[PDB]
Amino acid sequence: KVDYIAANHIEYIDYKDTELLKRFISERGKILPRRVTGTGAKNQRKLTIAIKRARIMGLLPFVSDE
Amino acid sequence: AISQERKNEIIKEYARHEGDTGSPEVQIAVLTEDINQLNEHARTHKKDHHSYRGLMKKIGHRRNLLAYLRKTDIQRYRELIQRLGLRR
Amino acid sequence: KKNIESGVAHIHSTFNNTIVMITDTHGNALAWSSAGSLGFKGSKKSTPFAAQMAAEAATKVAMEHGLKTVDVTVKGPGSGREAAIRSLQATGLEVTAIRDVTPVPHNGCRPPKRRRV
Amino acid sequence: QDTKYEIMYIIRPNIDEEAKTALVERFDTILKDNGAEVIESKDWEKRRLAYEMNGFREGIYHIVNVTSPSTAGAINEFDRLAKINDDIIRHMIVKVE
């Protein structure tokens, strides 16, 4: 009964879709685990590598506490 | 490893007859080109230990097939080792 | 003097001492206060009893130079910052930003030995 | 087959107008001059950055699509020329799926 992103077939994360990607981060700048969102297994790894690419090109800072 | 282009080259210019993709005369030439390329990789990178185990397994299996074929027809065996360039 | 009148205070605390300093928005310093500097000795500097009077001895010298608003910055999580803020409100300040920035690594260097006690 | 290598490289916002086209066309030459085959190399987005690099908290992104076999040498040559420059800040080369 838990949340997911597999209904809308975003089959490739596109490395740029950072406005949809805001679902899976937090205020402090961390990652919600799969215990939180209830997403898929391999989808979690894809999103994880995706946002680690995204943290490098100025699309999300590491530290956001200001 | 090898691409399917040179793979499908050598599995058909060395096959016995039509439909042969088993036929242990084929597999030894396939393994021969594979272990030559892996030998060149081991010469380039000389501490990739986890692929050298695969070299050991391939050369052992080619040895088993090569010693199989000699216990059936020594003439085919001689023709291949005069043809494929091995057995020092 | 110059009556800057809008600054940030800094609360730095250990497990055996604490230091409060009220600074500017830079923060260039106005006045600091230390639990050892107010006559305490030994282990008593851990308790927030020194935090209240350290905040008082800071704010007196602070608003002699003119001071209205203040922001809170917290380091070194222990006992001091729990009562330093509410004692800092007591001598007439305008606390409006409370943050707890901790110097946190991402496993850079090594911590020392454990204590076999 | 070949591959597909995105290059999403950060362009300074304080360049002149011919500087943009001259720089994009020059790096399109150095990809074309060593056998690699570019397809669609456009500008992407003026954007403010999440944090600075030196003082640039804003920038203009870019995107290309080059296809080439792995046996060439321009891609690492593009890396060497990109790191010695200043006007391009950060680039990342990601295989396309």
Place this chain on the structure above:
RNA sequence: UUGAGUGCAGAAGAGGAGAGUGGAAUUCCAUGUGUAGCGGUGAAAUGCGUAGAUAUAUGGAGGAACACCAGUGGCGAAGGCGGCUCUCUGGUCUGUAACUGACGCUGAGGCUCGAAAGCGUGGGGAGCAAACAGGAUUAGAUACCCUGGUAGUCCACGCCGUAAACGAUGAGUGCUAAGUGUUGGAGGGUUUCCGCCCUUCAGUGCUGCAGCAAACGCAUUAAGCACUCCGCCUGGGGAGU
């Protein structure tokens, strides 16, 4: 052709090496602001500070390790492997069957790999810290406690080849009730399937019949019923001398 292998179609993955790169945090240096303490303990002391410390903002230098993701999750023959981008390259699973036609398994001698600590040659030191110095505790303390501090920990190239290297359970195959999670698949019912339900493959946990066991316990990932091959044992010390 049933075992054993290459087809063609896919899939997952901290598998390995080589080359670059990212930010935070510590330490040092510079600058401004700012004065009498900072640091440590059960309690103190050694120590650093008016040659301006600690603290707070700005930069500059360098090394090491990769915060959340992270899960009884994954990979590998084991030792082991977690930031990111790229080149070479090893291995496993699922379908299917045209193709080879018993080509297999185990394997004394031999070879290869093999955590930390250690040795040689040449680099670098951010922390941490054997040896050592000082303070403290004690009847005494060549320790536990606090302040410092070298070799080392890192990289490249050679050497040694050990561990509580453990699931303290050698390897190959077949057979013998269930229930429940979870990783990766294939098929069917249904379908915005992304959910769900049924069938089936390879791992991976947890609970429990028969059966075994001196007990504890194990139990389709057997320590059950068996066959093939290898290693080892025969009271404790003396002594892995």
